[PDB]
Amino acid sequence: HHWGYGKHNGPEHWHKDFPIAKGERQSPVDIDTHTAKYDPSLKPLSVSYDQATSLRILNNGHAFNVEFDDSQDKAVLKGGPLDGTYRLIQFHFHWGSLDGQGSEHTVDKKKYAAELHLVHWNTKYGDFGKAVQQPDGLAVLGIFLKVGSAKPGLQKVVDVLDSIKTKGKSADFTNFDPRGLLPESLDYWTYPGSLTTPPLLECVTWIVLKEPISVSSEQVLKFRKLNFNGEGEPEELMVDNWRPAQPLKNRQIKASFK
Ligand SMILES: CC[C@H](CNC(=O)c1ccc(S(N)(=O)=O)cc1)c1ccc2[nH]ccc2c1
Ligand SMILES: [Hg+2]
Numbered sequence: 222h223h224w225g226y227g228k229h230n231g232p233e234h235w236h237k238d239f240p241i242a243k244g245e246r247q248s249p250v251d252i253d254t255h256t257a258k259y260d261p262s263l264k265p266l267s268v269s270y271d272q273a274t275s276l277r278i279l280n281n282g283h284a285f286n287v288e289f290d291d292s293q294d295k296a297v298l299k300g301g302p303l304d305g306t307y308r309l310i311q312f313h314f315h316w317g318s319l320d321g322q323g324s325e326h327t328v329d330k331k332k333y334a335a336e337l338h339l340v341h342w343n344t345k346y347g348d349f350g351k352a353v354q355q356p357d358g359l360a361v362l363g364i365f366l367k368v369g370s371a372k373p374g375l376q377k378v379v380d381v382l383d384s385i386k387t388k389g390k391s392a393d394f395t396n397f398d399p400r401g402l403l404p405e406s407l408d409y410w411t412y413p414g415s416l417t418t419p420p421l422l423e424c425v426t427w428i429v430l431k432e433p434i435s436v437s438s439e440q441v442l443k444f445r446k447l448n449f450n451g452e453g454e455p456e457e458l459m460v461d462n463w464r465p466a467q468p469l470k471n472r473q474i475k476a477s478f479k
């Protein structure tokens with residue numbers, strides 16, 4: 222039936238409706254830090270989120286998305302392995318039912334508690350729909366979340382989760398500054414991949430930050446109270462909305478640091 226993360230409609234079943242699931246540049250992947258090629262030609266990443274305009278938080282049945290006004294170059298990602306300007310359209314997380322899993326990408330087979338995906342699309346393509354039809358249409362900045370001290374910047378998000386507990390619910394969520402979610406360092410690994418949830422389009426230049434951000438146990442706990450189901454249906458806790466690592470195949474993961 223409709224795709225999900227359960228036994229009967231999960232990642233292992235995706236290839237049936239989305240043949241690209243078994244494609245050449247699927248994400249996420251395991252970042253083998255020792256096979257990763259340090260690349261001194263990679264520029265530093267440039268994250269300009271000062272003019273960021275968040276609009277709302279939406280529980281879409283598979284995660285909760287914080288959407289941003291991407292009608293202008295308000296919050297953009299440039300540099301690094303990117304050619305051109307990528308606009309922030311939304312960010313979401315993938316988390317586990319337990320702290321030892323939840324990330325999509327793994328570093329040396331290590332799973333983090335969650336993974337923040339700041340989704341950007343290449344402005345040369347005009348709109349998000351067009352960019353998803355291009356090899357370099359998307360740039361997702363992935364940030365690992367490890368359980369530790371609270372990330373103050375993530376608290377506004379956590380607080381509004383009560384309002385969007387079920388599928389389909391949305392809440393006004395303005396004046397949220399995504400810079401509060403960035404780790405201290407912007408070093409990254411980059412490789413060409415795809416969306417990690419159907420349609421699994423292979424339009425993503427993945428920029429996975431080396432340094433994770435730490436969030437508190439209480440914070441990730443509130444993620445786990447979200448529901449996959451809509452209001453009125455049997456309750457299915459939104460946890461483990463992550464896709465397992467896919468074969469790297471003919472790809473090289475480059476690193477911006479030694
Ligand atoms: C055209 C359908 C599209 C749906 N999908 C996504 O946006 C998406 C984004 C990132 C990732 S991941 N896990 O790889 O980081 C997976 C999926 C979609 C859906 C609703 C929309 N509203 C505005 C734009 C827009 C785009
Ligand atoms: Hg594509």
Ligand SMILES: [Zn+2]
Pocket residue numbers: 313314315338417
């Ligand atoms: Zn994601």
